[model samples]
Target: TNTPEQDRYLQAKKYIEFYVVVDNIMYRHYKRDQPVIKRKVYEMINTMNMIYRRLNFHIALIGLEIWSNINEINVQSDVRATLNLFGEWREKKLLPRKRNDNAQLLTGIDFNGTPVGLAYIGSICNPKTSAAVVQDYSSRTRMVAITMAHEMGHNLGMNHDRGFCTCGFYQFSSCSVREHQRYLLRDRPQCILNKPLSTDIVSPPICGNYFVEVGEECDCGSPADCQSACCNATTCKLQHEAQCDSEECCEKCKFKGARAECRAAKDDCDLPELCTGQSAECPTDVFQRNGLPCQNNQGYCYNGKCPIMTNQCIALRGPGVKVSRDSCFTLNQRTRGCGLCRMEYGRKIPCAAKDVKCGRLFCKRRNSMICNCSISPRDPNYGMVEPGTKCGDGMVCSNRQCVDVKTAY
Candidate 1:
């Protein structure tokens, strides 16, 4: 009956300890602050708690620590220098009030007219060991709270949502969406993977692959490499006139063509069903087919002709080519022969061409070739009809007409 949070408690005697503090100048600002540093600290804590709750952990605040009024402490500094200072202060000298081995710290400061606060975790610090630095007034009031929360998250092991190379990074405040392209995961502020302790939270499809001076060089190295022979190893780009096979490069492809051809071959109910190479029958043909002429044991390409439907009809051509059926009148319902046939199944069938089908109301055409009659003259479309141009309302196409078949002659 243990829940995600209860499960964490059951496994170990561990809890996260947190510290929110400000040095001399920031302490003075907090005492006379408009947005109130205490309230800002509370806001940041709430955000961090939400992120961790899903991971099955809780935030335990050890109260705010105020430093002595020492001008020697350079509180008026940028975020990076401040982080180095915080890390130095922590590793060199212990906190004045003392903290347990589990204590994680974040120090607050004040920025000028910036809209968001600047923040970062100590370079040499781990989530359970390092102190992170944050600011209150970067650009706006609310942003100050957000920036503090962001810095705290970094201290606790969370990264930016669309971080650099998609591994996610924490900057002054929020995750930079633009710079974090190609990594399409959710940002940490909205991430639910923080709780429960055991989640493998950082592995990704788009880690620091692109070159960045500060962060990473390559990621998902062997797995992300292209399977095709034409893919360039250095650039990761598929070279021009590159060929692809369905079995290796694209599981969805039907044959070896360009990338577009690979994608185009997957449409199931498109005009012509893609040749399965395995399915010996035509996708939507009553008799016509394509590929390697007429191998009765194999599947054909899109240029094959319709097999003779009736004994009277003559097959003037073979598989994968236009076929001439002399008995065309029955092929197109006898009135105008294949001219009355739907365009999709190679209409105007009396002419010597293949890639056509005739029989019943449904005439399936070869794959890829444009349908001679894309729309059925008699088969009107209906909204109530489901997908695949399938039959609707107890109706099916029969002998070139949408009608009831069971009660017919």
Candidate 2:
């Protein structure tokens, strides 16, 4: 017999509605025909969905943009430059027009003489940098589609192959799964957590597809493949006396007890969810409100995480990395050295006296070895004081500003 906790973790699924922008060159490559371009984009997204399905993620193409006339943000040969430009454009232009979990740009230009794509690692749900740029370099759409999937994997925190691998192609490795789980549980990219409306899906609803869509009470799969005793495979309906086909709060075809633990808290910032007994689905996940002390007072909770400097240092530079002395944090006051600095209109601003502890993070290796870990200033977790880190007794760092914790509420 499976417990509710096991069922909850096993049944957890996420949805990602992505937007695609085709540059003029890519559009022209597809003959500048909107229908053909849309069909190809849909096919690519479908392939990506197939790849992500292994990780309990459903990918959908929510919006498509075709630059049929001219380039949108000056498509360049440099992958990094193009990615930065696309990110800025997505933040300023595309995001306002349409909301999406992530946006990707497809271009025909070769990046520095090689067909490569670039994306910010683990940038899902982040409005400023949750975007990627892929170079379409193959006549076969599936090749480019795989490239798109690879770039999206990076966005989801999956690194390239490292250790032993099992799935050859068209599947993610165990490392990827671990990375994806870390991204989901730690970062909690809320944008991709909700299932999309059935009407919003591009594909027409079909019975026996395992997804309960419009007019369907429940769906397990095709009759031959379905194994749910609660759902009638032929009609996609609940079996006799069955209250729910499948859900964490439903067991043996009936709703579980009220107040039963459905979702366990993953961290100090996360909140456990209990079954309501009225519905088969578990309640939405919640977390400690921002500015709440966490990690034994080493940090404050923000966005469901206690981002401690030492933890971040270890994650970035492996084990034996410790936060530097108090003097290191003082460097942030001068807008120099290893510490967080706020950027405004492309200019770096020094941390105020009250917020110095909330500025850039400084770390040193345990052995006093030459620590040369380069920091990416753009990434908040890299050598920068993470938001929600306690700066003072009652103050927390938020958006590079030190403010009273009550203000976060």
Candidate 3:
């Protein structure tokens, strides 16, 4: 209760002492300047909040109560600092769609750790475009709702899924047929990990990862220098082939019967050309780079099978990869916090909002991911615990410290 760092992640990850200033409202024939949320917006946030309790997420409330002491200073800027922070936090941009899910496609935009990325309630300046928007405009309930889960999935360390599955809510498209590529997550039914037919007992496979980035390179000094990246990226090649027409190596890739080039692999999902003459077995199948069958998995490559590649985090049993049958981070997110060790588990539990369940944070049920402002105090298990304490069944007591569970309790 003093500080929940001992056992529960209910401990504060980082503390923020917020500042607030009150604004006086004059009733002498004054009209509101800025747009307010529509009635539907409130309803939508309310609807999603109902589901939030089940998901393991904590809503860190920012600025709310205004300070009454600021009236004496004649500061011209009202909420100017708030807008400035928004400018900085929204460093990265998102693409916006016009009409939502007509046929509904998953237009999942990935934002890594930007304040904008962290928001469940995102704001927008232009209706059609996503760039230069405010945080928490409140119209994009499903978009920000899913986006909040998607980006936080990365914070928890889950990557984008290769399957590119949909979420519970599809966006509202103007047309009759919404495409999956255009939208990020499908509405409740077509979503990844969703029930196949309601009658079937088996759980359908969830999306492979969430909020993925691609071709992420780092200065490792060693070939192992870089770190694990996007959820969509299955495997990686640290080394590149240089035997092409130009220093860029792309010229040789243009024509047949040429040397290898820097062009992306033909069978690569990142490519615009969906390599013809392929099957589900395509993962293992080799593509003829000028009759040189350059394979993706190389020695491990098979025939036409989609390669069963795991994220780099998986080498340590990171999120998304099933390290053990019963144990893994929520949705088994990316490798930064491996499930094998104590700090790994410790890293995850601290971020939840007060008065919520841990199961709500699972990366698998991102569509169901939700968090509401809670009035109740937290449970003891939900808050801080001693660090390095040996705990769960699969956990190791390294250096006399209690370890995180192979499966968190």
Candidate 4:
């Protein structure tokens, strides 16, 4: 929901769009730019495409408009970089890119956000969000989908997943590293990639996480012979479990009637009551970030923490909000949309597939992890469903209403 004053927010439905600017070198590869990484880029792009398509988008159309100004990290001057374009972008930009800026004039001039991100390009602006990060590292698209989806989560002011590996079977664990790693032997790195690894030390680049669903590829940290042509997780499990080698559980691991999830498991007893049902973490109180507003009296909060904003994550400060003392700036008017997002702009963003995490779920911004943040993206059922359309797996057309897939990206 939005202010009644904003007409755009008053619409019956909303759209999400995404635009692209492959820059110089990447432009030359696939589709005339970064050909080596073309398949990867296209696959990532489909996360958004297939998602909207899966949604049966009626008033929306996942958009893509690649430009030529990306020159910094996209130049790909070496063989190693030939296959590392997106990784390079993630390294430089610190934040992944997603969504269309068309709705309110989100381009031109400098804003806190970037029109074009670079090597490890994500930007974690605490000055802007008074909240912790949201990430989606469970997909094969890796952090790209997660990055966009994550930022979108922040945009909506949603918090990260504080609860741990609960497969919704009520078998919960703490999402924190210390507790989970300690109890379950799921030894994480010195620093867990809490947020999807970006190139920045602020957020390092971990392995290539996918943009698909949770428990994909690899052994999904679970125990249940997941036979994949590309992955053999027996050893993978030990590595994630903190064993020197397969020293922990040299054998296969499995859960109760589920895929072999992870060998290491941890738990946290001192947690807010709210994080029980989901994977999001709550922020600390006494923090005056993101306008720091108190939330409604919903037992749905944890650690005295509440989302910075509500329903939809929104960047508290517009284009011009000063970040650091030396980083104050008033973003371009275009970047700071004058009114609510519109259909034209919404069409630019691709509705993410099951891979991308954390976007629509909480952070209004887009990363991969998702759970439904805004009412935008116009319901896929808007008069498009028909009898016997053969919807994708687990999909239905109830009373001519098209049901979307079950992933957050």
Give the TM-scores of the predictions, in the order they appear: 0.32, 0.75, 0.19, 0.22
In model 1, which regions exceed 4 Å deviation? Answer: 1-14, 31-40, 95-97, 100-129, 138-142, 159-409
Instruction: Tell me the deviation in Å of residue 391 in model 3.
Output: 26
Going through the candidates in the order shown, the clash numbers are: 35, 3, 74, 115
Candidate 3, 293-349: lDDT as tens digits = 123422111221122212211322345542122232222222232211112434533
Q: Judged by lDDT against the true structure, how good is candidate 3?
A: 0.24
Whole-model lDDT per candidate: 0.36, 0.77, 0.24, 0.27
Which candidate's lDDT is highest?
A: 2
**What is the total number of backbone clashes in candidate 1?**
35
Per-residue accuracy of model 1 over 286-309 as CA lDDT, tens digit each: 223222222232212222221222
Candidate numbers, best lDDT first, in rank order: 2, 1, 4, 3
User: Compared with the true structure, what per-residue lDDT tens digits does model 2 show for residues 175-267?
Assistant: 786776666555667777676665566643456555566777887868998898999988888999999887778999989989998778766
Please report how far candidate 3 places residue 60 from its true position, in Å.
Answer: 5.5
Q: What TM-score does prediction 2 earn?
A: 0.75
Report the C-alpha displacement of residue 131, candidate 2, in angstroms: 3.2
User: Residue 369 error for model 3, in Å?
Assistant: 48
Candidate 2 residue runs with Cα over 4 Å from true position? 1-11, 25-33, 76-84, 106-120, 134-144, 162-169, 173-188, 206-209, 232-243, 252-257, 312-318, 325-356, 362-384, 392-409
